[PDB]
Amino acid sequence: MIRSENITNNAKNILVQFNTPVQINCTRPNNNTRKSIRIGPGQAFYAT
Amino acid sequence: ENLWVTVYYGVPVWKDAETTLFCASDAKAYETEKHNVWATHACVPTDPNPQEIHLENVTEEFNMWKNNMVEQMHTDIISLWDQSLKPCVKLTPLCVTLQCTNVTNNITDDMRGELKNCSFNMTTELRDKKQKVYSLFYRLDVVQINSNKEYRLINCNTSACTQACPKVSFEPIPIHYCAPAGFAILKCKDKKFNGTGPCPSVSTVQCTHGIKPVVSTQLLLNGSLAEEEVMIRSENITNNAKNILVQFNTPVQINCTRPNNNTRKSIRIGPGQAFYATGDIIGDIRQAHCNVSKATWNETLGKVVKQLRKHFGNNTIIRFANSSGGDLEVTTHSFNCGGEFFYCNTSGLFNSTWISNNDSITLPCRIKQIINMWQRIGQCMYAPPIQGVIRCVSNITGLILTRDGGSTNSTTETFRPGGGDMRDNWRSELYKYKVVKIEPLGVAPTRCKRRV
Amino acid sequence: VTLQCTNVTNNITDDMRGELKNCSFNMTTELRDKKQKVYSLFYRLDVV
Amino acid sequence: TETFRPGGGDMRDNWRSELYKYKVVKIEPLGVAPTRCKRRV
Amino acid sequence: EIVMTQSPATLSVSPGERATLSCRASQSVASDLVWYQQKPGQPPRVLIYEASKRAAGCPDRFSGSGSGTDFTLNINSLEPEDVGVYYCQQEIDWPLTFGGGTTVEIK
Amino acid sequence: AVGIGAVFLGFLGAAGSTMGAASMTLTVQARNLLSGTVWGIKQLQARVLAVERYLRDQQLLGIWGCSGKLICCTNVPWNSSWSNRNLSEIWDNMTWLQWDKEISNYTQIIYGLLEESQNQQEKNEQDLLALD
Amino acid sequence: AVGIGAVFLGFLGAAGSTMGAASMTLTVQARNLLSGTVWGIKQLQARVLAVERYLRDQQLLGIWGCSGKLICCTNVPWNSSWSNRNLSEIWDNMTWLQWDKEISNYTQIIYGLLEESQNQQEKNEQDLLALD
Amino acid sequence: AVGIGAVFLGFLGAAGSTMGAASMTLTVQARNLLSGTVWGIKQLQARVLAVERYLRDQQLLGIWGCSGKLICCTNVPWNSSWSNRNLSEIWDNMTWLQWDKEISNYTQIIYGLLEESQNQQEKNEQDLLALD
Amino acid sequence: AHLVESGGGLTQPGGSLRLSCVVSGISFSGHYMHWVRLSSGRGLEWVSGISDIGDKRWYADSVRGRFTISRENAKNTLYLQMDNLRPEDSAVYYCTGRAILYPRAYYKDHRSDVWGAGVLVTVSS
Amino acid sequence: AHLVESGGGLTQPGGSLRLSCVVSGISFSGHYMHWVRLSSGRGLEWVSGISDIGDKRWYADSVRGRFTISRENAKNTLYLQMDNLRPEDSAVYYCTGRAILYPRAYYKDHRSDVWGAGVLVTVSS
Ligand SMILES: *[C@@H]1O[C@H](CO)[C@@H](O)[C@H](O)[C@H]1NC(C)=O
Ligand SMILES: *[C@@H]1O[C@H](CO)[C@@H](O)[C@H](O)[C@H]1NC(C)=O
Ligand SMILES: *[C@@H]1O[C@H](CO)[C@@H](O)[C@H](O)[C@H]1NC(C)=O
Ligand SMILES: *[C@@H]1O[C@H](CO)[C@@H](O)[C@H](O)[C@H]1NC(C)=O
Ligand SMILES: *[C@@H]1O[C@H](CO)[C@@H](O)[C@H](O)[C@H]1NC(C)=O
Ligand SMILES: *[C@@H]1O[C@H](CO)[C@@H](O)[C@H](O)[C@H]1NC(C)=O
Ligand SMILES: *[C@@H]1O[C@H](CO)[C@@H](O)[C@H](O)[C@H]1NC(C)=O
Ligand SMILES: *[C@@H]1O[C@H](CO)[C@@H](O)[C@H](O)[C@H]1NC(C)=O
Ligand SMILES: *[C@@H]1O[C@H](CO)[C@@H](O)[C@H](O)[C@H]1NC(C)=O
Ligand SMILES: *[C@@H]1O[C@H](CO)[C@@H](O)[C@H](O)[C@H]1NC(C)=O
Ligand SMILES: *[C@@H]1O[C@H](CO)[C@@H](O)[C@H](O)[C@H]1NC(C)=O
Ligand SMILES: *[C@@H]1O[C@H](CO)[C@@H](O)[C@H](O)[C@H]1NC(C)=O
Ligand SMILES: *[C@@H]1O[C@H](CO)[C@@H](O)[C@H](O)[C@H]1NC(C)=O
């Protein structure tokens, strides 16, 4: 289903709705390590 | 035979419910200009003549361990303590290195290494200039970091403290928790009520009596006394992990004082922020102590043991031991005497054995300023010093006891003081109250139909 | 603060060339008097 | 030809795809209408 | 329980003629009696609920009346579509038993 | 000023009595139902719920025909599934609390019968009666 | 009356039916008008707005001669300038929404004659001609 | 009855007028009694107070036999100890504000006299033979 | 309560005129405004009229279509446009308003029939 | 308003079966559900009956105690778990629903009486 307000005008977005869900897998191929750096009294800064 | 439904409005019908309860207090402690941590100037003025109405043939079931009034009260206590500190100074520039020397100065009789004379570099109104000021901290407030040793505060690793407001007072005044119109607060008037089960004497008072929000561990302070005997109330008396709340028939008077004559000095740590620090104690330096009368405490412990023989074993010996361990709020007895937070040893009181067949007990206390209240790791409050000699007279109206694992079944019952959880403190005064919602609508058949 | 950053070029990466930066900087500790010298990995989109 | 490119930016367009079928109305229970009925004195 | 006694099992009448049915009772049923139609191969459906009032979709030919013990079902115009088995079941006591069964065949 | 002395039973005082005695004290538990930073929020949140509970009670008393009546007679018959006791075991052997715990499932069948099948009929019947 | 159940209509169920058939569902839509801190003020202003709307509707209903009245007859005469169409075209041929769209211009005028030219006149006559 | 407008009297439009003439503005004064972070909780409190002040004017009126009534008769005698004149010098030459300004002390003892000699006295007479 | 008028004048047939009736005192929103002209031989005859709520304009049988009536509740003015004129329209035009004060028992006279000072328009070749 | 009931089968006597009637369209929680079986000679014999509000169950005198009935309002499913079978129980079983639609003049037919299609239970040795 294609939904738009004024689809003859190019300045309006077109919200397309799907019938079947296209599956997408997203990953980060990195084993980061969270390191807590204490920056103040009761404050921490978690860094890579 | 020709039964028609009829509507009755105003029937005496209630069901148990949980609802918000507002505040009420006496107008004598309400019009005063001295502000309290427990805001009371926003409370409703109380009724001069409360309506205590007795119900005949009403047997209602109360449960003090699943009581929502205690949780609502605890939420209100935490909220009030949170919002009363927002206006005061944030003591975040206090986290600097400290060069502390032990105060071995002009008396130092038994306060050997408790008071520390700490000098630190502090900011001022001008951000590019720094001042060298000194303050007298306690041993519980400082910790070493690796003569003039290097120190730091105990909180600076965990949190940043907010200094308490110097004009507010941590004095518990009575608070009446009242239910909205359309609700009711039942009251168990039974004298043998253990906290759970049916109560034959139920009264529908409009709202509760004055419940003072007293901060205490291991010694329930002044409040509601039991009417006839020493009452033991436990959620499960056959459980080793349930606290044993005890009420007292007679109150045990405890006198607590600080013999030091403290001096408050203002250290301006910014544009409009002042750090009220300990100056120099003039006169005599002595350890702060609480004394409990030995004749009264022995009779009171004797009444506790005698009423504890029914629950466990009538020939089983009862032995009182000191606290096991943990944090200072659980290990020692903590309270609030005029704004100064004590942490008193209870080894003098809970040291006895009881076979089935005129002095004072001096308790050595330990004053701490930087405290972690309500066991919240991340929020701390700095109590400012109070100049002059302080003294409190208080009624020990109860105990919080923790039982260890039963050795060889029922041979000896070792009871130690517990505490730590602040919901057990409000349970000693809200045990007899519960909140019900009232449904006045009711349908019932009669022989009368509507005349058309 | 003034982050002193270098390119990573560790392991074998992949030509993620110039995407991760190894930044070392002076950060305050719990005490106001003392300072730390900690290091952290920052993406190229975060650092200027 | 009609060249289409992806958009984005306005975050409200994500929730227009879920809230397109719902709308909120207020309800007025009072109403007047003519009959032959009149009340007594 | 309130036993239900019905008419004889066959009242086969040629179409276009008014057919009259009835079913008896042991004790009083008052106004709570219904009627059903089960075609062969079809689940049953109601005709006259509360012994006087027609259901939805039923034609004007199906009419029922009666109170107390004796009740009557009146079929004004008979149709070849109206072949089926007739039942009446009480609804004032608890067991809710049905009728014996009356089968009308098309002549 | 004939007749001297004044003692009231108090609010909810007939709760242990039977329904035949607690239905004679309906004025006491009706007049006292409303009677007209934190602790500024909870006081506000309490006197909103105090008005809402009263108005929900009065709306459900005004949509049936009992607008301002303490004892209200209606036209729905009492079906035997709700209770099988013949009046005596209700009004002389049972309190109102036990009656609430007995008819608690059927508080929506009874209410819908009070509204739709009878009160919405009674106003329309009065409409057709005063039409001519 | 032994094997029957209980199924009700539901809120706004007769919105597509005609006003002659949707005039007997008024008790169904008269129930859900009342329905009994960080972002607790959207739940606290919503519980006062509904109370205010319900009380405004009740007070507007009660300043007429209709106290606790679902279908209330008034002897305010119907004007021909508000709707020229007659009976059997309103109650059998339109729903309530179309009639509301037709009468939304003159509803303030109709409320003014139900208030001023009827109630404070019938109540003044009750305390004058009758009840001395 | 055609070709003429309809202009309504504004709020408090008969403030300065005789009480007989101001007795026909009761619907005018009763319609506008309900009116349909920082700066959000104070007006919420004001709306709750306005709702709770709309009540106790319907709850003082409702406990007597005048609920839903604008002009209500009461069986309570007017003793001459209060400020009393003839009806020609009250309803024809005198405003409502002046009448409130004379009886400013006796209005409280009237409300105590309407809950004692109107109700709980005639109410007990009704309770002598209540249900037939 | 003064219905002051303006506009108009002497114009050849086929011209366009607009008459302005600025109102004061009375409530313009709830007033049914008319337009009645007074001519020699046929004095005080109806022309147009507009409702108080709505924008329904009722006209006479003879002069329908040749006049356009409009009102504005913001500037509190009433208009009448005079297009496609005929020589029988030489008359003085009165701006009048009618409303029923609804208390009716509070108001002794509930007839709010307000009139105004007429302006004279004439049409000739 | 469709009742897709299932179950049945051929089983020796003394066994157990589970007839599940799946309810769609109508309000299941407000409907009074019974069970009616039909065999040769036993014209529409009653089996069981369950309520809509409350869990009171009523059984016939011949089949009392052996059989059990249950329902889930969140699942719209009705079960008649047969136990201790007898050869006279060989019948086709109808999932029956009964309710009165209480706005009884807006509904001209204030009676549901919708019954299921029917599943056949055959028991023999
Ligand atoms: C949406 O559909 C309606 C009815 O089919 C139609 O009138 C309208 O023009 C459509 N709008 C668009 C943007 O397609
Ligand atoms: C849509 O856009 C066109 C031109 O792009 C414009 O003429 C029109 O007014 C717009 N709006 C509509 C069709 O509602
Ligand atoms: C309580 O029960 C006793 C015995 O039935 C009765 O005499 C008494 O009146 C009852 N009390 C109340 C609540 O009236
Ligand atoms: C603490 O040390 C300061 C100097 O740093 C000194 O002036 C002061 O007297 C000392 N106070 C005590 C109690 O020793
Ligand atoms: C404060 O800072 C000065 C230098 O600015 C230093 O000489 C002194 O030792 C410091 N005092 C402390 C850390 O107590
Ligand atoms: C408390 O007393 C009740 C009797 O009133 C009893 O049933 C219950 O077991 C007791 N509970 C404990 C923990 O002693
Ligand atoms: C302590 O108890 C005594 C009774 O022995 C009482 O008079 C006194 O007021 C109590 N003190 C409090 C509650 O602070
Ligand atoms: C109390 O403790 C015993 C033993 O620890 C346990 O069996 C029981 O379930 C507990 N709870 C009660 C009695 O409610
Ligand atoms: C506490 O002090 C009061 C007077 O201040 C005295 O009467 C009482 O005996 C003291 N109690 C103890 C335990 O010292
Ligand atoms: C007083 O305490 C001792 C133990 O310290 C105990 O043996 C003695 O029995 C107690 N006296 C009384 C009267 O209980
Ligand atoms: C405990 O023993 C004593 C005897 O000295 C007796 O009076 C008391 O009732 C006993 N309590 C029990 C068995 O609970
Ligand atoms: C308890 O008393 C014992 C003496 O037997 C002592 O060793 C222990 O440190 C004490 N613990 C506390 C927490 O006071
Ligand atoms: C309490 O007293 C005991 C024995 O007197 C002692 O061992 C202990 O260190 C003291 N302090 C604490 C905090 O337990």
Ligand SMILES: *[C@@H]1O[C@H](CO)[C@@H](O)[C@H](O)[C@H]1NC(C)=O
């Ligand atoms: C208990 O008291 C006795 C004598 O008063 C003492 O010898 C013993 O050490 C004390 N025990 C504890 C744990 O305080």
Ligand SMILES: *[C@@H]1O[C@H](CO)[C@@H](O)[C@H](O)[C@H]1NC(C)=O
């Ligand atoms: C405590 O010190 C203050 C001055 O700081 C003095 O006025 C007061 O008398 C002293 N009190 C005692 C008991 O020494």
Ligand SMILES: *[C@@H]1O[C@H](CO)[C@@H](O)[C@H](O)[C@H]1NC(C)=O
């Ligand atoms: C980043 O540089 C530091 C030296 O400042 C080094 O210790 C660290 O291993 C480097 N990190 C990586 C990922 O190479």
Ligand SMILES: *[C@@H]1O[C@H](CO)[C@@H](O)[C@H](O)[C@H]1NC(C)=O
């Ligand atoms: C950190 O401070 C040192 C001096 O203490 C300086 O040499 C170094 O450049 C600083 N690191 C920065 C600015 O990244």
Ligand SMILES: *[C@@H]1O[C@H](CO)[C@@H](O)[C@H](O)[C@H]1NC(C)=O
């Ligand atoms: C109904 O119960 C009442 C109880 O008083 C009894 O008098 C009456 O006989 C009962 N009716 C039947 C039919 O059992």
Ligand SMILES: *[C@@H]1O[C@H](CO)[C@@H](O)[C@H](O)[C@H]1NC(C)=O
């Ligand atoms: C009415 O009572 C009968 C008999 O118990 C019951 O079967 C039926 O379900 C009830 N109906 C309603 C609507 O309560």
Ligand SMILES: *[C@@H]1O[C@H](CO)[C@@H](O)[C@H](O)[C@H]1NC(C)=O
């Ligand atoms: C009255 O309504 C009927 C509709 O049945 C219509 O035929 C008739 O013309 C109407 N009469 C008038 C005068 O509008």
Ligand SMILES: *[C@@H]1O[C@H](CO)[C@@H](O)[C@H](O)[C@H]1NC(C)=O
């Ligand atoms: C009916 O409406 C007309 C408007 O065309 C108005 O002139 C007339 O006064 C109204 N009738 C009544 C009784 O107000």
Ligand SMILES: *[C@@H]1O[C@H](CO)[C@@H](O)[C@H](O)[C@H]1NC(C)=O
């Ligand atoms: C003001 O007084 C006069 C007295 O003649 C009266 O006519 C007028 O109606 C009064 N004011 C109003 C508008 O009520």
Ligand SMILES: *[C@@H]1O[C@H](CO)[C@@H](O)[C@H](O)[C@H]1NC(C)=O
């Ligand atoms: C009128 O007032 C007098 C004196 O103030 C009093 O005696 C009399 O009872 C009053 N009348 C009534 C009806 O109360």
Ligand SMILES: *[C@@H]1O[C@H](CO)[C@@H](O)[C@H](O)[C@H]1NC(C)=O
């Ligand atoms: C009041 O005026 C009326 C006029 O109708 C008169 O009959 C009556 O006697 C007067 N009352 C007094 C007390 O003057």
Ligand SMILES: *[C@@H]1O[C@H](CO)[C@@H](O)[C@H](O)[C@H]1NC(C)=O
């Ligand atoms: C009402 O009280 C005031 C003050 O006591 C008094 O001046 C006034 O005269 C009183 N009113 C009457 C009508 O007497």
Ligand SMILES: *[C@@H]1O[C@H](CO)[C@@H](O)[C@H](O)[C@H]1NC(C)=O
């Ligand atoms: C209602 O008023 C609007 C605006 O004045 C108008 O467009 C519409 O035609 C009117 N409807 C009726 C039925 O008078």
Ligand SMILES: *[C@@H]1O[C@H](CO)[C@@H](O)[C@H](O)[C@H]1NC(C)=O
């Ligand atoms: C009401 O329902 C509950 C659970 O569904 C049931 O236990 C109870 O018996 C029911 N009440 C009656 C009177 O049947």
